[PDB]
Amino acid sequence: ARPTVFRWTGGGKEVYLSGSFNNWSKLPLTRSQNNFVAILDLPEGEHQYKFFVDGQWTHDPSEPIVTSQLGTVNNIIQVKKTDFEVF
Numbered sequence: 001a002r003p004t005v006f007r008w009t010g011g012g013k014e015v016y017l018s019g020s021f022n023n024w025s026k027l028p029l030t031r032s033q034n035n036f037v038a039i040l041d042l043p044e045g046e047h048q049y050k051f052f053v054d055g056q057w058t059h060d061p062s063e064p065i066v067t068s069q070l071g072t073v074n075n076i077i078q079v080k081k082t083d084f085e086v087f
């Protein structure tokens with residue numbers, strides 16, 4: 001598993017990260033310089049995720065997206081051979 005950085009740049013007061021890698025629970029993100037951020041160790045390969053921003057499910061329009069089998073929009077990224085890549 002490689003350290004991987006998630007960064008929400010869309011603002012807000014309170015932000016959670018939800019994705020396949022935490023079974024779609026809600027991880028509190030840390031405010032840092034107008035970002036909200038978290039760092040997770042993730043195995044190489046695909047992950048889907050989304051944000052929960054002041055009470056509302058939101059994706060990041062600047063990362064790739066896909067429609068899930070539930071019929072919802074997630075971000076989709078590919079963890080590769082780099083430590084602390086920012087998504």
Ligand SMILES: OC[C@H]1O[C@@H]2O[C@H]3[C@H](O)[C@@H](O)[C@@H](O[C@H]4[C@H](O)[C@@H](O)[C@@H](O[C@H]5[C@H](O)[C@@H](O)[C@@H](O[C@H]6[C@H](O)[C@@H](O)[C@@H](O[C@H]7[C@H](O)[C@@H](O)[C@@H](O[C@H]8[C@H](O)[C@@H](O)[C@@H](O[C@H]1[C@H](O)[C@H]2O)O[C@@H]8CO)O[C@@H]7CO)O[C@@H]6CO)O[C@@H]5CO)O[C@@H]4CO)O[C@@H]3CO
Pocket residue numbers: 024050057068069070071072073074
């Ligand atoms: O919780 C896990 C989950 O979280 C994230 O989803 C959130 C999402 O981003 C939000 O937008 C919001 O979703 C609401 C949405 O906006 C509304 O449209 C509505 O959803 C309706 C759909 O429009 C409509 O498609 C229909 O859905 C039916 C499906 O067509 C059908 O396929 C089936 O769904 C089942 C799947 O086939 C199955 O794979 C399994 O789903 C899993 C996913 O594959 C998986 O990615 C993950 O889902 C994430 C998700 O990707 C995030 O975006 O977890 C799933 C395991 O549970 O299970 C399905 C059976 O439940 O069934 C449904 C109908 O039963 O109907 C809905 C009307 O509800 O409502 C949304 C509010 O719930 O919220 C979610 C988090 O709640």
